[PDB]
Write a protein that binds this ligand. Structure first.
Ligand SMILES: CC(C)(COP(=O)(O)OP(=O)(O)OC[C@H]1O[C@@H](n2cnc3c(N)ncnc32)[C@H](O)[C@@H]1OP(=O)(O)O)[C@@H](O)C(=O)NCCC(=O)NCCSC(=O)CC[C@@H]1C(=O)CC[C@]2(C)C(=O)CC[C@@H]12
Ligand SMILES: CC(C)(COP(=O)(O)OP(=O)(O)OC[C@H]1O[C@@H](n2cnc3c(N)ncnc32)[C@H](O)[C@@H]1OP(=O)(O)O)[C@@H](O)C(=O)NCCC(=O)NCCSC(=O)CC[C@@H]1C(=O)CC[C@]2(C)C(=O)CC[C@@H]12
Ligand SMILES: [Cl-]
Ligand SMILES: [Cl-]
Ligand SMILES: [Cl-]
Ligand SMILES: [Cl-]
Ligand SMILES: [Cl-]
Ligand SMILES: [Cl-]
Ligand SMILES: [Cl-]
Ligand SMILES: [Cl-]
Lengths: 196, 196
């Protein structure tokens, strides 16, 4: 549930914090609020984390390490750029389904946090997934899977935005799973970028 | 530049306020900040607006009245659902190009403000444009322009999100106009929802 943690007590507390951060906002949530939510003294919460910033650092690193490990496995296991693009696209929806709070915290806070040295990895990961997308789009154009005159930066931003921003409306209690939503978004994107 | 105002002094001040709200955030901006920006006393700014909330009310009403008047003209002047959908889609990009601050303020604040009686029109307009999109998608499916099994609510949210969220990255100083970006986003959406 919390990407990059295990079922340890720390992991339990980070899950509770992530839910609070996602619901209330990071800057609206204190260590005291989290401790109250857990039924513990603040001092006991401070036996697991040095600060709230450290909690958010553990949440975002865990999420990004999980997501980029998925991306690595997808890139390595797919046989051509069309398959690869399909799997990379669906991973956004896997993230929304299973790590919803982390996705929301990323989208609400990562751009702001990225100027702090503690969060220098947010820009590193941003560049890395952009290069990943540009490379699969270029290879798909070069081999004739995708339409030849597509502007790959534009299509990258289209894909990034389309898929990830669905976290703002997707409700896990609703009738469709995130995978079903992703499949339908994918069908549209593929109709629009494949050749023929 | 400010949708729904004219080049009056009020209009000049609302433009300055909109830019500040979009840049700094509404709750981070005071009437004093705006007055300082304009070179006037707060008391003189209070000869044009009763409060900051009234400024935001004038900005969002002006924007929405402008946008929904565009939508009305597009619906009435297009000859079939495919043409109509093309024109409605491009209007998002016209809004981003020419009323950028208003779009940003909407996306940053309208959901929060909508629970206040002053902003009861935000939900009215939300329902209205959703019905507009669902109706054009249904008619296009019924007449064979669009793929027959599309989930129209899903495609509505896909279209709404795709296009409007590009305000978060689009820079007016950049090489592409918003119209060029819109045209390319449209080509992808049409490849993905048209029949054949
Ligand atoms: C405040 C709005 C109008 C809320 O939209 P909405 O009332 O559609 O709520 P939603 O959270 O987007 O979607 C909830 C629906 O998702 C459906 N849903 C949930 N999970 C499931 C599930 N698992 N299975 C199936 N179904 C499910 C759920 O059923 C539900 O259905 P409904 O009651 O209509 O039947 C909206 O602006 C917004 O912030 N929406 C959240 C999405 C969002 O932020 N996206 C980012 C880009 S979208 C955007 O900013 C457009 C602003 C656009 C613009 O900027 C200018 C002004 C505009 C044109 C307007 O007047 C209105 C729209 C305005
Ligand atoms: C903090 C990010 C990573 C910033 O992205 P980026 O560095 O691409 O900046 P940008 O503002 O999106 O795009 C700037 C580019 O637009 C281009 N541009 C500007 N205007 C023009 C013009 N007029 N002509 C042509 N070109 C132009 C401009 O040139 C420039 O180019 P570049 O320096 O790369 O060459 C991004 O998350 C974000 O907030 N981006 C703003 C768009 C946005 O909020 N979209 C909403 C949904 S996108 C989203 O939330 C994805 C989060 C996604 C996710 O949630 C989980 C974690 C993820 C996978 C990551 O690690 C990174 C992405 C993460
Ligand atoms: Cl994990
Ligand atoms: Cl890696
Ligand atoms: Cl393109
Ligand atoms: Cl499923
Ligand atoms: Cl106007
Ligand atoms: Cl109207
Ligand atoms: Cl569909
Ligand atoms: Cl142009």
């Amino acid at each position: 549930r919390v990407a990059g943690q295990v079922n340890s007590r720390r992991g339990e507390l980070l899950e509770l914090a992530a839910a609070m951060f996602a619901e209330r906002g990071l800057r609206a949530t204190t260590v005291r609020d989290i401790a109250d939510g857990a039924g513990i003294l603040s001092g006991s919460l401070y036996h697991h984390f040095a600060s709230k910033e450290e909690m958010v650092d553990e949440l975002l690193r865990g999420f990004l390490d999980w997501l980029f490990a998925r991306y690595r496995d997808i890139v390595d296991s797919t046989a051509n750029p069309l398959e690869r693009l399909q799997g990379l696209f669906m991973a956004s929806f896997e993230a929304i389904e299973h790590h919803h709070a982390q996705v929301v915290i990323y989208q609400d806070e990562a751009q702001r946090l990225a100027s702090q040295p503690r969060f220098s990895y947010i820009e590193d990961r941003n560049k890395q997934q952009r290069k990943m997308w540009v490379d699969v789009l270029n290879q798909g154009i070069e081999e004739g899977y995708f339409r030849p005159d597509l502007d790959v930066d534009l299509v990258y931003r289209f894909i990034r935005d389309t898929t990830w921003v669905s976290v703002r409306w997707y409700r896990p209690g609703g009738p469709l799973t995130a995978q079903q939503v992703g499949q339908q978004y994918l069908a549209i994107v593929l109709g629009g970028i494949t050749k023929e």
